[PDB]
Amino acid sequence: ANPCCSNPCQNRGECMSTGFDQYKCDCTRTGFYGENCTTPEFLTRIKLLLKPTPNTVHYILTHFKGVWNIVNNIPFLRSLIMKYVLTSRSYLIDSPPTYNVHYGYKSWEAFSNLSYYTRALPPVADDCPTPMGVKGNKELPDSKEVLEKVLLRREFIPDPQGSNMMFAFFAQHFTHQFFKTDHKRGPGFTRGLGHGVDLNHIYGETLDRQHKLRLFKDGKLKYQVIGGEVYPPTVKDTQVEMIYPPHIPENLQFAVGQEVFGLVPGLMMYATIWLREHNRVCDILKQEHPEWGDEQLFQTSRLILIGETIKIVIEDYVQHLSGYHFKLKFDPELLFNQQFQYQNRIASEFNTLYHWHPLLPDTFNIEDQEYSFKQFLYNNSILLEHGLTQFVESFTRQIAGRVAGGRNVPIAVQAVAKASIDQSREMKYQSLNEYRKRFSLKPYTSFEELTGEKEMAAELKALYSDIDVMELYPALLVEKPRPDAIFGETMVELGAPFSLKGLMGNPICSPQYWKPSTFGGEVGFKIINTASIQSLICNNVKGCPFTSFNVQ
Amino acid sequence: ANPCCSNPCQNRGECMSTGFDQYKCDCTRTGFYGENCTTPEFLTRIKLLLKPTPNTVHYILTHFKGVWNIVNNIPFLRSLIMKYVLTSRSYLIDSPPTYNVHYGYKSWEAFSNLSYYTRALPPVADDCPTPMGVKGNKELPDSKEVLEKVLLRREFIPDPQGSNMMFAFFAQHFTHQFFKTDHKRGPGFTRGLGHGVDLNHIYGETLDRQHKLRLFKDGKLKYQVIGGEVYPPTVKDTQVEMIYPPHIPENLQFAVGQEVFGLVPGLMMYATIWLREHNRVCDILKQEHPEWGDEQLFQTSRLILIGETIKIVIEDYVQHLSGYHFKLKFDPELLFNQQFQYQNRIASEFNTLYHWHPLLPDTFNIEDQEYSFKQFLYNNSILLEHGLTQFVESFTRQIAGRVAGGRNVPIAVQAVAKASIDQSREMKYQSLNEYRKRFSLKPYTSFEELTGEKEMAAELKALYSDIDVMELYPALLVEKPRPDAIFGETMVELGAPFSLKGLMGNPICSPQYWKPSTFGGEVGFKIINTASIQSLICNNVKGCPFTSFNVQ
Numbered sequence A, B: 001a002n003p004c005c006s007n008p009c010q011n012r013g014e015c016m017s018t019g020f021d022q023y024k025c026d027c028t029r030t031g032f033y034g035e036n037c038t039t040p041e042f043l044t045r046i047k048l049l050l051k052p053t054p055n056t057v058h059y060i061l062t063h064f065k066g067v068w069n070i071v072n073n074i075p076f077l078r079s080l081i082m083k084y085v086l087t088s089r090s091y092l093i094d095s096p097p098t099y100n101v102h103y104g105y106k107s108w109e110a111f112s113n114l115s116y117y118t119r120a121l122p123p124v125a126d127d128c129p130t131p132m133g134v135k136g137n138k139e140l141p142d143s144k145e146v147l148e149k150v151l152l153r154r155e156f157i158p159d160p161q162g163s164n165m166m167f168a169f170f171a172q173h174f175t176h177q178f179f180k181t182d183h184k185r186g187p188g189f190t191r192g193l194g195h196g197v198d199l200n201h202i203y204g205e206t207l208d209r210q211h212k213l214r215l216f217k218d219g220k221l222k223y224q225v226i227g228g229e230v231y232p233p234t235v236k237d238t239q240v241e242m243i244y245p246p247h248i249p250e251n252l253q254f255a256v257g258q259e260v261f262g263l264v265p266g267l268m269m270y271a272t273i274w275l276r277e278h279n280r281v282c283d284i285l286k287q288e289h290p291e292w293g294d295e296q297l298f299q300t301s302r303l304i305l306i307g308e309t310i311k312i313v314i315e316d317y318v319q320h321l322s323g324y325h326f327k328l329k330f331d332p333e334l335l336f337n338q339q340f341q342y343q344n345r346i347a348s349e350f351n352t353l354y355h356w357h358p359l360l361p362d363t364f365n366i367e368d369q370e371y372s373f374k375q376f377l378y379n380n381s382i383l384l385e386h387g388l389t390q391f392v393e394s395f396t397r398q399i400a401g402r403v404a405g406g407r408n409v410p411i412a413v414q415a416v417a418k419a420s421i422d423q424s425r426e427m428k429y430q431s432l433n434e435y436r437k438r439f440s441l442k443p444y445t446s447f448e449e450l451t452g453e454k455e456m457a458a459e460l461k462a463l464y465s466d467i468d469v470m471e472l473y474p475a476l477l478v479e480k481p482r483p484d485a486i487f488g489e490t491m492v493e494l495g496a497p498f499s500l501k502g503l504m505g506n507p508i509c510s511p512q513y514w515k516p517s518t519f520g521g522e523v524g525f526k527i528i529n530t531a532s533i534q535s536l537i538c539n540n541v542k543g544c545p546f547t548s549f550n551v552q
């Protein structure tokens, strides 16, 4: 009987109850007034008429290759354009943060406690008649049925943007430093207390773990040689807890920063490349500074690789996803005269939307073999057999699957995609349309509008009845794609504002950090400002193989 | 060894070592260039010709009362002047933070680890030949020697600005939520992980402790009634940990946020006052929101009390130090069109500079009683015998001591003063003049200029030999005060920027937090926006006694 269950307040205003059956919207700063904040101020009307849509802005950025080439080669214009991509999205995220799984009103508990993931929209209250609020049946549809009807794979669908296994395993590698759900406490809690890109997946969370993995000479990380080739050290040597099953022998239990990376050989491939990069950067700084000791050689090297990570994510990874002919840029200076809060907190909804399991193929194709999931998982024997070089050639070739578009989730991993739906409801996620309004988008008026077709749309109607009851995770994996694109509209417009805050809100982008002495001089600063996915591979893998986040 | 020991790089330039005996300065965004960042850019010269000194500004806000009398009453103007006091300060503090006691270069470990206090200037390196880097003798003067000669009180010196014991105990009480040193680890570490105004001294550091302190009905805090007067609850009842000497009987072991507050009866005064307040705010919030439950009551009250703390801090407490005829405002909307980061980290030098033990009188005077240190400390029966009303009346009347100007630390607490000296040296603090430069003040050119007299200057020159080797903390309590003022130049110009960062950087002062609905309605917002020390006492002390931070 909470009178805010129906989400009455609009355009980002806030609902407060003023009696057992009465509510009241606080419209402050929202550019609208009236009972439910639906009447615009004069200025706000003009702003709306002149502002374009996400789908129109997408057209321009993905057409006119000749105009964008002129723009891409004038340094001054390129910067101005990129500034606009950055600034036009900051307002979409709340920072300092606000809600979480247990708090639908701003509290000190919801602000102070770094073990929760924060939330873009608050959770439906426990005393609301229906799960979404006051719309829909008493219980949501069966998740197993949604899994089977519109998510699972029949015939493999490839990414028409030509993504590959270098890209998928890099997605999985990067993200698994900040997305680390503490399943003991629940779906809405986290073990990455750094909230953002601290490279804990190489160096460890605690100080205790960090020291076990360090050599204490020349700033380096422990390692071992097998087959005349540098690999991570063992568990028997170092004492770092890893999640292996007991039938793995001692000499194959590798130790790295992220306790879970032993369970896939693609994770452990990047694992070894990033480790090699650290020790390579140690050698560079050592020559520049023979006066430096072990700690400063280490602590500076970590700063450089946080620089490299962010650089590649913006100019190779997000560049590849985007589709754009415009060349994106990592250059923190664009924000020094703007209103940016250098800070971040991981949103539950960012974790949920990044479950891109439809990328994974039915088999894994290295050299002359086709490995199955049961053969691939837990099996580092494969790595040593083939070597880093063969892995890179082979995974640059193999094509990954389409995320949006529906019905392309691998059966090996059906359990996982079902968990995504169940844990959403358990965390009390508001509906798709309330989430699209939250990020300034037009609500879908039908299931056919969502999927751009008739078969899955017809299924989804029968199961949900009202389009305003449709859920976020499933909608993302079924949404109509952009032309020859990997993703739909909702994925990108929610995904991007979350991502940019965790990349640019890193303290090394802050004015007082972003200067050459921070990283050991000009020589260091240049590693960050010329890093790429192709050089990361070439510097650290025998014979310097060609690579890319797309098939050729 | 280290070729940056002599502190070459001026104007905030950062020193780096490019080999065993050769350095380099990073002048990025300083305004200067050249080997040591000393050659000014054109606009920098121009700005230094127009900027007035801090003493010029001080004189202007403390004269012209007929002109400030009009400004105050015309709200348009008032706001423009506050916005000047707020923004003129901001360039001084590093936010995100940078250094700490172990790291004199920037590092993930220094940024990431919330257990340290931060550092405004970096530590002096270990392998430097002297304590201040290169200047002075092998070792500093004997701290006993320093303490006895210029710091200890001979005869009591009253504060010319009329500061009383209400102000003494508000200072101690208020700041002991974020100055909470971890003496097992060492002086550069903290137990206060909110690095700010979270009010852990009323509610607790951990969710564990807070729950033990709460009533779980109407959002209230637990309490007991002794002779018709409401006091905090026992340790028996709560199970919360406090620090009492063995002889204290079960019924006088009170339970409060900060575990150390039982030791001093003046602290217990304010802890009982704010507890009565919290519960008072709950009763109001229930007449308004009879729908609400226990969590939402407790949590909105705790948000409201934070705002009252900040309100009273700026418009009574800091207003009283200032001596200004102009009336300060607490208004978060003044920073909504400025660049300002909404975060903070407490800094060692803030901790050190706020050891204002010269405030303490020779005895604590209540009704017709003059209690000694020995009698006053650890003895809460004194508070139960006289009662809140009479504690307030007595403390509104009793003048506290002058801090600056020398020779006013009372003997009882001399070991504290010495420790302040010795711990600074332990934490490798730099010189006084290195700190004055850092906050854009003029370095002192002699001990006589610093003190404004002859006798202490001669004894200090005899000990230190060179003005450039003088230490920060003893300097603060020796400094020539402003005309009839409690402090001098240095204390304020370092103090104010650190503090405004802790007041205004509070998450409750951002755009998304600062609006009626965060505080449960317009009623709740009114309780912050008309808060004062006078009303805090009036509503929570029997007979609404008159109070103030200065003797009539």
Ligand code: HEM
Pocket (backbone or CB within 6 Å): A168, A169, A171, A172, A173, A175, A179, A180, A181, A264, A351, A354, A355, A356, A357, A359, A360, A413, A416, A419, A420
């Ligand atoms: C063979 C490779 C993979 C396997 C075996 C796998 C399987 C799993 C499993 C079992 C979970 C735990 C879910 C739960 O218990 O509820 C998980 C989490 C997750 N996966 Fe994968 N997945 C793989 C590849 C990927 C890829 C390519 C991505 C794309 C970036 C991805 C994204 C995620 C995300 C975001 C989570 C949640 C992380 C967290 O909250 O802790 N996964 N995966």
Ligand code: HEM
Pocket (backbone or CB within 6 Å): B168, B169, B171, B172, B175, B179, B180, B181, B260, B264, B351, B354, B355, B356, B357, B359, B360, B413, B416
């Ligand atoms: C009148 C009774 C007081 C006594 C007996 C006293 C004595 C002491 C002692 C023994 C310590 C170190 C041990 C501890 O943490 O308990 C200390 C530290 C300190 N004192 Fe006091 N003091 C008194 C009042 C004040 C006042 C009026 C102020 C004014 C602001 C003040 C400011 C501080 C500060 C900021 C610290 C450092 C605390 C920390 O870092 O944890 N004290 N004092």
Ligand SMILES: *[C@@H]1O[C@H](CO)[C@@H](O[C@@H]2O[C@H](CO)[C@@H](O[C@@H]3O[C@H](CO)[C@@H](O)[C@H](O)[C@H]3NC(C)=O)[C@H](O)[C@H]2NC(C)=O)[C@H](O)[C@H]1NC(C)=O
Pocket (backbone or CB within 6 Å): A113, A114, A115, A116, A184, A185, A186, B206, B207, B208
């Ligand atoms: C961030 O929020 C979390 C959720 O509130 C806190 O984690 C919770 O800490 C509680 C104790 O401080 C646990 O409460 C349980 O309480 C009973 C009653 O006293 C105890 O017997 C139980 O042992 C205790 N724990 C368990 C596991 O039963 C909560 O369980 C615990 N976690 C969860 C998921 O609820 C964090 O402490 C908080 N952060 C901070 C700094 O306080």
Ligand SMILES: *[C@@H]1O[C@H](CO)[C@@H](O[C@@H]2O[C@H](CO)[C@@H](O[C@@H]3O[C@H](CO)[C@@H](O)[C@H](O)[C@H]3NC(C)=O)[C@H](O)[C@H]2NC(C)=O)[C@H](O)[C@H]1NC(C)=O
Pocket (backbone or CB within 6 Å): A205, A206, A207, A208, B113, B115, B184, B185, B186
């Ligand atoms: C933030 O900073 C603090 C300083 O680095 C950390 O506190 C230190 O944690 C260490 C744990 O790794 C303690 O180590 C002691 O010393 C040896 C070193 O080899 C260990 O084996 C011992 O087990 C350990 N204990 C004893 C009794 O020797 C440090 O002593 C400890 N304290 C201090 C004052 O330095 C914090 O851990 C750190 N937090 C994080 C998250 O990084």
Ligand SMILES: CC(C)(C)c1cc2c(cc1Cl)C=C(C(=O)O)[C@@H](C(F)(F)F)O2
Pocket (backbone or CB within 6 Å): A085, A318, A321, A322, A487, A491, A492, A493, A494, A495, A496, A497, A499, A500
């Ligand atoms: C808007 C634009 C340029 C297309 C864009 C696309 C992005 C990202 C950022 C931007 Cl600005 C970051 C992404 C990530 O971090 O994975 C992904 C995202 F789908 F959002 F998840 O693609």
Ligand SMILES: CC(C)(C)c1cc2c(cc1Cl)C=C(C(=O)O)[C@@H](C(F)(F)F)O2
Pocket (backbone or CB within 6 Å): B085, B318, B321, B322, B487, B491, B492, B493, B494, B495, B496, B497, B499, B500
């Ligand atoms: C510049 C002006 C207005 C005089 C000023 C004075 C202050 C403070 C803030 C300002 Cl803006 C805060 C203070 C504190 O927190 O105790 C003290 C300080 F001495 F600085 F420590 O007095």
Ligand SMILES: CCCCCCCCO[C@@H]1O[C@H](CO)[C@@H](O)[C@H](O)[C@H]1O
Pocket (backbone or CB within 6 Å): B148, B149, B152, B153, B154, B455, B456, B459
């Ligand atoms: C009450 C604390 C003083 C006892 C310790 C002896 C310190 C001696 O110090 C002397 O004190 C004289 C009298 O105040 C001053 O005139 C001298 O300048 C000073 O050197």
Ligand SMILES: *[C@@H]1O[C@H](CO)[C@@H](O)[C@H](O)[C@H]1NC(C)=O
Pocket (backbone or CB within 6 Å): A374, A375, A376, A379, A381, A382, A385
């Ligand atoms: C693991 O990989 C090895 C090496 O190719 C292979 O022979 C073996 O069958 C795999 N083991 C399992 C349990 O699948």
Ligand SMILES: *[C@@H]1O[C@H](CO)[C@@H](O)[C@H](O)[C@H]1NC(C)=O
Pocket (backbone or CB within 6 Å): B375, B379, B381, B382, B383, B385
């Ligand atoms: C504390 O003061 C009271 C008077 O209020 C006195 O009776 C008592 O002796 C003192 N207590 C102790 C433990 O010294």
Ligand SMILES: *[C@H]1O[C@H](CO)[C@@H](O)[C@H](O)[C@H]1NC(C)=O
Pocket (backbone or CB within 6 Å): A006, A007, A008, A035, A036
């Ligand atoms: C808000 O709009 C109007 C009042 O202007 C009212 O008819 C409507 O019922 C209000 N809110 C909802 C959720 O219907």
Ligand SMILES: *[C@H]1O[C@H](CO)[C@@H](O)[C@H](O)[C@H]1NC(C)=O
Pocket (backbone or CB within 6 Å): B006, B007, B008, B035, B036
């Ligand atoms: C910096 O100042 C000048 C260079 O202009 C040089 O003579 C001097 O020795 C340098 N170092 C120091 C410590 O002043």
